[PDB]
Short mmCIF file of all heavy atoms in Angstrom, two decimals:
data_model
loop_
_atom_site.label_atom_id
_atom_site.label_comp_id
_atom_site.label_asym_id
_atom_site.label_seq_id
_atom_site.Cartn_x
_atom_site.Cartn_y
_atom_site.Cartn_z
N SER A 794 -2.65 -5.13 -0.08
CA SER A 794 -1.53 -4.91 0.82
C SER A 794 -2.01 -4.98 2.26
O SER A 794 -3.16 -4.67 2.57
CB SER A 794 -0.88 -3.56 0.57
OG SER A 794 -0.34 -3.48 -0.74
N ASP A 795 -1.11 -5.41 3.15
CA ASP A 795 -1.36 -5.33 4.58
C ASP A 795 -0.58 -4.16 5.17
O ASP A 795 0.09 -3.40 4.45
CB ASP A 795 -1.04 -6.65 5.28
CG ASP A 795 0.43 -7.04 5.20
OD1 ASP A 795 1.24 -6.31 4.58
OD2 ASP A 795 0.78 -8.10 5.76
N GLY A 796 -0.68 -4.01 6.49
CA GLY A 796 -0.02 -2.89 7.15
C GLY A 796 1.46 -2.81 6.86
O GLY A 796 1.99 -1.73 6.57
N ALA A 797 2.16 -3.95 6.92
CA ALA A 797 3.59 -3.95 6.66
C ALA A 797 3.89 -3.52 5.24
O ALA A 797 4.84 -2.76 5.00
CB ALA A 797 4.17 -5.34 6.94
N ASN A 798 3.09 -3.97 4.27
CA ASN A 798 3.35 -3.58 2.89
C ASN A 798 2.98 -2.13 2.62
O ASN A 798 3.64 -1.47 1.81
CB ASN A 798 2.60 -4.51 1.93
CG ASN A 798 3.04 -4.31 0.49
OD1 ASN A 798 2.27 -3.81 -0.34
ND2 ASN A 798 4.28 -4.69 0.18
N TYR A 799 1.93 -1.61 3.27
CA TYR A 799 1.65 -0.18 3.20
C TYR A 799 2.87 0.64 3.63
O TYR A 799 3.27 1.59 2.95
CB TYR A 799 0.44 0.18 4.06
CG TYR A 799 -0.91 -0.19 3.48
CD1 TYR A 799 -1.88 -0.81 4.26
CD2 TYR A 799 -1.23 0.10 2.16
CE1 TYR A 799 -3.12 -1.14 3.74
CE2 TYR A 799 -2.47 -0.23 1.63
CZ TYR A 799 -3.41 -0.85 2.42
OH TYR A 799 -4.64 -1.18 1.90
N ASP A 800 3.46 0.27 4.77
CA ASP A 800 4.63 0.98 5.27
C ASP A 800 5.83 0.82 4.34
O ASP A 800 6.62 1.75 4.17
CB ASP A 800 4.99 0.47 6.67
CG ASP A 800 3.87 0.69 7.68
OD1 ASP A 800 3.11 1.67 7.53
OD2 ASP A 800 3.75 -0.12 8.62
N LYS A 801 5.98 -0.37 3.74
CA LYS A 801 7.09 -0.58 2.81
C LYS A 801 6.95 0.32 1.58
O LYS A 801 7.95 0.86 1.09
CB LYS A 801 7.16 -2.05 2.40
CG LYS A 801 8.41 -2.43 1.62
CD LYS A 801 8.46 -3.93 1.35
CE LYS A 801 9.84 -4.36 0.89
NZ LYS A 801 10.32 -3.59 -0.29
N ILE A 802 5.72 0.49 1.08
CA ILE A 802 5.50 1.38 -0.05
C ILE A 802 5.85 2.82 0.32
O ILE A 802 6.54 3.52 -0.42
CB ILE A 802 4.04 1.28 -0.54
CG1 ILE A 802 3.74 -0.12 -1.05
CG2 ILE A 802 3.76 2.31 -1.62
CD1 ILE A 802 2.26 -0.39 -1.23
N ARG A 803 5.36 3.27 1.48
CA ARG A 803 5.64 4.62 1.94
C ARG A 803 7.14 4.87 2.06
O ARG A 803 7.62 5.96 1.72
CB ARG A 803 4.93 4.87 3.27
CG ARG A 803 5.06 6.28 3.82
CD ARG A 803 4.15 7.25 3.07
NE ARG A 803 4.31 8.62 3.55
CZ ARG A 803 5.03 9.56 2.95
NH1 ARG A 803 5.68 9.28 1.82
NH2 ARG A 803 5.11 10.78 3.47
N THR A 804 7.88 3.88 2.56
CA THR A 804 9.33 4.04 2.69
C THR A 804 10.02 3.97 1.33
O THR A 804 10.88 4.80 1.02
CB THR A 804 9.90 2.96 3.62
OG1 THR A 804 9.32 3.10 4.93
CG2 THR A 804 11.41 3.08 3.73
N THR A 805 9.65 2.99 0.50
CA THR A 805 10.36 2.75 -0.75
C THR A 805 10.03 3.79 -1.81
O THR A 805 10.90 4.21 -2.58
CB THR A 805 10.04 1.34 -1.27
OG1 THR A 805 10.51 0.36 -0.34
CG2 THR A 805 10.72 1.10 -2.62
N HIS A 806 8.78 4.24 -1.86
CA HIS A 806 8.32 5.19 -2.88
C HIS A 806 7.67 6.39 -2.19
O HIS A 806 6.44 6.56 -2.25
CB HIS A 806 7.36 4.52 -3.85
CG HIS A 806 7.89 3.24 -4.43
ND1 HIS A 806 8.79 3.22 -5.48
CD2 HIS A 806 7.66 1.95 -4.11
CE1 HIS A 806 9.08 1.97 -5.78
NE2 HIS A 806 8.41 1.18 -4.96
N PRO A 807 8.47 7.25 -1.55
CA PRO A 807 7.88 8.33 -0.75
C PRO A 807 7.14 9.38 -1.56
O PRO A 807 6.33 10.12 -0.98
CB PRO A 807 9.10 8.94 -0.03
CG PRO A 807 10.27 8.58 -0.90
CD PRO A 807 9.94 7.25 -1.50
N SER A 808 7.37 9.47 -2.87
CA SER A 808 6.64 10.42 -3.69
C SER A 808 5.23 9.96 -4.03
O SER A 808 4.40 10.78 -4.42
CB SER A 808 7.41 10.70 -4.99
OG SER A 808 7.44 9.55 -5.81
N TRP A 809 4.94 8.66 -3.90
CA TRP A 809 3.64 8.14 -4.28
C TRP A 809 2.56 8.55 -3.28
O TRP A 809 2.76 8.47 -2.06
CB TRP A 809 3.67 6.62 -4.37
CG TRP A 809 4.54 6.05 -5.44
CD1 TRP A 809 5.39 6.72 -6.27
CD2 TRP A 809 4.66 4.66 -5.78
NE1 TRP A 809 6.03 5.84 -7.11
CE2 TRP A 809 5.60 4.57 -6.83
CE3 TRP A 809 4.07 3.49 -5.30
CZ2 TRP A 809 5.96 3.35 -7.40
CZ3 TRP A 809 4.42 2.28 -5.87
CH2 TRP A 809 5.36 2.22 -6.91
N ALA A 810 1.43 9.01 -3.79
CA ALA A 810 0.19 9.07 -3.02
C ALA A 810 -0.58 7.78 -3.29
O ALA A 810 -0.85 7.45 -4.45
CB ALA A 810 -0.64 10.29 -3.39
N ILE A 811 -0.90 7.04 -2.24
CA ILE A 811 -1.44 5.69 -2.39
C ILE A 811 -2.77 5.57 -1.65
O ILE A 811 -3.17 6.43 -0.87
CB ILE A 811 -0.46 4.60 -1.90
CG1 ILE A 811 -0.50 4.50 -0.38
CG2 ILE A 811 0.95 4.87 -2.42
CD1 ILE A 811 0.42 3.43 0.18
N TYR A 812 -3.46 4.47 -1.94
CA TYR A 812 -4.69 4.07 -1.29
C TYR A 812 -4.90 2.59 -1.57
O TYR A 812 -4.29 2.02 -2.49
CB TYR A 812 -5.89 4.88 -1.79
CG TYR A 812 -6.24 4.60 -3.24
CD1 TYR A 812 -7.30 3.77 -3.57
CD2 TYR A 812 -5.51 5.16 -4.27
CE1 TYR A 812 -7.62 3.51 -4.88
CE2 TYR A 812 -5.81 4.91 -5.59
CZ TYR A 812 -6.87 4.08 -5.89
OH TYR A 812 -7.18 3.83 -7.21
N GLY A 813 -5.76 1.96 -0.77
CA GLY A 813 -6.10 0.57 -0.99
C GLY A 813 -7.16 0.41 -2.06
O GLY A 813 -8.36 0.50 -1.76
N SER A 814 -6.74 0.17 -3.30
CA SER A 814 -7.68 0.10 -4.41
C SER A 814 -8.58 -1.13 -4.34
O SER A 814 -9.67 -1.11 -4.92
CB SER A 814 -6.93 0.13 -5.74
OG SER A 814 -5.80 -0.73 -5.71
N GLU A 815 -8.15 -2.18 -3.65
CA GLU A 815 -9.00 -3.36 -3.47
C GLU A 815 -8.53 -4.07 -2.21
O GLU A 815 -7.35 -4.39 -2.09
CB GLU A 815 -8.93 -4.29 -4.69
CG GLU A 815 -10.14 -5.18 -4.84
CD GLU A 815 -10.06 -6.05 -6.08
OE1 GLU A 815 -9.86 -5.50 -7.18
OE2 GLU A 815 -10.17 -7.28 -5.95
N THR A 816 -9.45 -4.29 -1.27
CA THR A 816 -9.06 -4.73 0.06
C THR A 816 -9.99 -5.83 0.55
O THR A 816 -11.06 -6.08 -0.02
CB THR A 816 -9.07 -3.57 1.06
OG1 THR A 816 -10.37 -2.97 1.09
CG2 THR A 816 -8.04 -2.52 0.68
N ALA A 817 -9.54 -6.51 1.61
CA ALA A 817 -10.30 -7.53 2.32
C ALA A 817 -10.53 -8.76 1.47
O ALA A 817 -9.78 -9.74 1.56
CB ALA A 817 -11.64 -6.97 2.82
N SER A 818 -11.58 -8.73 0.66
CA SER A 818 -12.07 -9.92 -0.03
C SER A 818 -12.37 -11.05 0.96
O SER A 818 -12.05 -12.22 0.72
CB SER A 818 -11.09 -10.37 -1.11
OG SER A 818 -11.56 -11.51 -1.79
N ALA A 819 -13.00 -10.69 2.08
CA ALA A 819 -13.58 -11.68 2.98
C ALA A 819 -14.74 -12.39 2.29
O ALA A 819 -15.43 -11.82 1.44
CB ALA A 819 -14.06 -11.01 4.27
N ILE A 820 -14.95 -13.65 2.66
CA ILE A 820 -15.95 -14.49 2.03
C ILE A 820 -16.87 -15.04 3.11
O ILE A 820 -16.44 -15.84 3.96
CB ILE A 820 -15.32 -15.63 1.21
CG1 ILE A 820 -14.11 -16.21 1.94
CG2 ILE A 820 -14.90 -15.12 -0.15
CD1 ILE A 820 -13.46 -17.36 1.20
#
């Protein structure tokens, strides 16, 4: 997820505690 999708999750599913389980994947 990016910043916008993090915010969308927080708004859409306010009961969820979330974290970035897999991020970046820069090469």
Side-chain angles (χ1 to χ4, degrees):
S794 298
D795 64 359
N798 190 249
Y799 283 135
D800 299 329
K801 190 175 194 306
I802 297 166
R803 184 76 182 100
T804 299
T805 297
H806 308 280
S808 68
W809 295 6
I811 79 179
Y812 67 101
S814 44
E815 204 178 305
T816 57
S818 181
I820 40 179

